[PDB]
């Protein structure tokens, strides 16, 4: 709303390369997947 | 009528429950008001102390023992009866 | 041209006398009273010209 | 030594004087009064109870009772020993 | 069974906190040295001191942590 | 006991904590 | 141009307590009513 | 019994980790005048004297990432310090958020450095100056060393508070336990006086943990 | 048995780690003391020591994570 243009110029300007949070969440998935086959195995 | 509920009279409690609109104001806006009427009260002035903090320190604290209550009346009872 | 200047000077110094005690000034007043700190150097949270 | 001069000594003298005069047990005189007081209780019961009255005085009705409350629990541990 | 395997295994893990004491007297001990060089500047040489003692306490702390991990 | 596998809401309530909340008060300041 | 904020803002007993407490039942209880 | 904080996510028929993470935010109000009260007077003076220490290193680049280093560290700093409150729940505990902290700012400046100075961000792995003829045998030394960064840094967070929590519960169950037999108060002076070191220690971790990424920055910028 | 064995040789497997606690603690001992003698170069001494501390840390990790991959 009334927030996003405060810090729109820090979100297009220097976090380009801080947003790159695929990894973390791939590595919280495979981890997830196979906690839930361990489980499931019983 | 649209006093404030501690001067609304006892048999008006269903009258002020009519009045009960726009009190919470979609709910956030109690939650506004409450958060100014303290906070523009013990810290809002001039010179504060210490008090402005330890309400709050302590209202979470009991808060937190509320949770547990659970497991330590489980098993850490001394005595029976 | 001295007359009007000095016409000038004299209100400047009219405006300079009549001054909120800064108890109840806000930052933009400030900087409507005198130049402050600017944006110009962009992406900080400090804007000091570090 | 010196603390129990200011406390003690004002515990027998302020204090008392604070304590003694609402802390000690009741002149049977005023055993009438307060039946009438339970005549004024009764009126209301009947009839007109709230009356539409002041929350506040009902706070400070219920706060009473609850200090009355207290003094069985501290009975039992009289008793428990 | 494995009451006994993991109670010895426990008191062999505890040994680790060896490190953590030397590394520490040796900070405190290069403290007192490096502040008698010269009387100024001591609060700074205390700040490193410091940070150093923390820093030796982190590296050797978590070998406990095993040890009751293994315990429960 | 820390690791039960249950690890989405953390991560996100603090992703969201953290990049709003504090630069946000912490960008209205002046030295 | 806020205006100037007061100089103190309330009184509490213990550091915990506020005064209103013992106001509010001074009547009734007394003087030392509540700590009982 | 004692591994019951730690793995307690905030126990309710809803989870509300959030409302106890989200909690610290209401304690720094934000200035709206020229002069404010005391509360707010001393946080910015703190704020001030802590940015002039850290941050006077990089040339330009590195000033950006200003507001998001004290955020980080204010943010650490006040999670910390409001547990040691007597049945308070510590998010840091977890090792969830720590390992969703070091990886997003770690990966950031890695692929930061190679993507304007490639040529110097690759001559890094080899260190500066001639390593006698052992060339082969320390470049596969420095860039495993790069990799375990991360993990070092989530993990010594995840481990030194339970260490301290689970050496505070011990004590406090040793001293109960011994009033039934015997009189000693030495076991009461042991936990007072370790709960000093317990309370100046999480300060400590947050500036480490500050500072070893300001000088990570610092390579590659 | 086989478990038994397994916690046993992880509990032992810990005790490596004392190692990194006494160069940690010589390396942050140097600093302060070279500092006092020349209080002009901090940059590169602090440099040179926060290698040195990122060095050493390998191998009391490498000998915890030996441990951790042995009991699981």
Same mark, same amino acid.
């Given at each position: ?13 220097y ?9 973390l ?10 906690l ?7 | ?5 501690? *001067?609304?009279?006892?048999?008006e409690?269903?009258s ?9 104001s ?26 402005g ?17 659970? *497991?330590?009346?489980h *098993? ?6 | ?7 000038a ?23 409507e ?5 600017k ?12 | ?20 005069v ?22 209301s ?25 207290m ?9 428990r020993? | ?10 008191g062999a893990?505890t ?9 520490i007297?040796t ?43 293994i315990?429960? | ?31 | ?8 803002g309330?009184?509490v007993?213990?550091?915990?307590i ?19 | ?7 307690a ?6 989870p509300?980790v ?24 001393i ?19 590195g ?38 902290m ?7 400046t ?31 030394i ?5 990799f ?20 505070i ?22 936990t ?30």
């Amino acid at each position: 709303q009334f927030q996003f243009t405060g810090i729109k110029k820090y979100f297009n300007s220097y976090t380009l390369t801080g947003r790159m949070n695929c990894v973390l969440a791939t590595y919280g998935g495979i981890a997830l997947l196979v906690l839930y086959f361990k489980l499931r195995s019983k | 009528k649209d006093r404030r509920l501690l *001067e609304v009279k006892l048999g008006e409690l269903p009258s002020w429950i009519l009045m009960r609109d726009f009190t919470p104001s979609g709910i956030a806006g109690a939650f506004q008001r409450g958060y100014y009427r303290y906070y523009n009260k013990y810290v809002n002035v001039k010179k504060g102390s210490v008090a402005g903090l330890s309400m709050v320190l302590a209202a979470y604290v009991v808060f937190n023992y509320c949770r547990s209550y659970k *497991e330590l009346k489980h *098993e850490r009872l001394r005595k029976y009866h | 041209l001295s007359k009007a200047r000095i016409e000038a000077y004299e209100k400047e110094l009219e405006k300079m006398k009549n001054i909120i005690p800064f108890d109840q000034m806000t930052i933009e007043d400030l900087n409507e009273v005198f130049p402050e700190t600017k944006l110009d150097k962009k992406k900080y949270p400090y804007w000091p010209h570090r | 030594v010196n603390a129990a001069v200011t406390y003690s000594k004002p515990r027998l003298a302020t204090f008392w004087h604070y304590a003694k005069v609402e802390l000690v047990p009741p002149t049977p005189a005023e055993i009438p009064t307060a039946i009438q007081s339970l005549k004024k209780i009764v009126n209301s019961a009947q009839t007109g109870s709230f009356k539409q009255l002041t929350v506040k005085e009902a706070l400070l009705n219920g706060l009473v009772a609850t200090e009355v409350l207290m003094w069985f629990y501290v009975g039992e541990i009289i008793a428990r020993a | 069974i494995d009451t006994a395997a993991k109670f010895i295994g426990a008191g062999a893990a505890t040994v680790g906190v060896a490190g953590s004491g030397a590394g520490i007297g040796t900070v405190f001990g290069s403290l007192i040295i490096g502040y008698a060089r010269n009387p100024s500047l001591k609060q700074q040489l205390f700040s490193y001191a410091i940070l150093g003692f923390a820093l030796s306490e982190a590296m050797g702390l978590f070998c406990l942590m095993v040890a009751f991990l293994i315990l429960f | 006991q820390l690791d039960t596998s249950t690890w989405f809401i953390t991560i996100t309530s603090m992703i969201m904590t953290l990049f709003i909340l504090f630069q946000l008060k912490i960008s209205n300041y002046s030295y | 141009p806020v205006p100037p904020l007061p100089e103190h803002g309330g009184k509490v007993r213990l550091g915990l307590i506020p005064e209103e407490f013992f106001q509010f039942l001074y009547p009734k209880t007394g003087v030392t009513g509540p700590y009982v | 019994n004692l591994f019951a904080s730690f793995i307690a996510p905030t126990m309710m028929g809803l989870p509300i980790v959030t409302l106890i993470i989200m909690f610290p935010s209401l304690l720094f109000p934000t200035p709206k005048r020229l002069i404010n009260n005391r509360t707010i007077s001393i946080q910015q003076w703190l704020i001030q004297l802590t940015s002039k220490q850290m941050m006077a290193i990089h040339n330009q680049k590195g000033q950006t990432w200003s507001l998001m280093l004290m955020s980080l560290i204010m943010f650490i700093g006040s999670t910390n310090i409001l547990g040691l409150l007597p049945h308070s729940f510590t998010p840091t505990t977890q090792l969830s958020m720590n390992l969703g902290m070091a990886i997003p700012l770690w990966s950031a400046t890695v692929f930061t450095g190679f993507r304007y100075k490639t040529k110097t961000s690759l001559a890094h792995f080899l260190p500066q100056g001639t390593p006698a003829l052992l060339i082969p045998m320390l470049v596969i030394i420095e860039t495993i060393s790069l990799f375990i960064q991360p993990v070092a840094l989530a993990v010594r967070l995840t481990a030194n508070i339970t260490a301290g929590h689970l050496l505070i519960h011990l004590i406090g169950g040793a001293t109960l336990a011994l009033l039934n037999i015997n009189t000693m108060t030495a076991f009461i002076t042991f936990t007072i006086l370790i709960l000093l070191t317990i309370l100046e220690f999480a300060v400590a971790l947050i500036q480490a943990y500050v500072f070893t990424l300001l000088v990570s920055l610092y390579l590659h910028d």
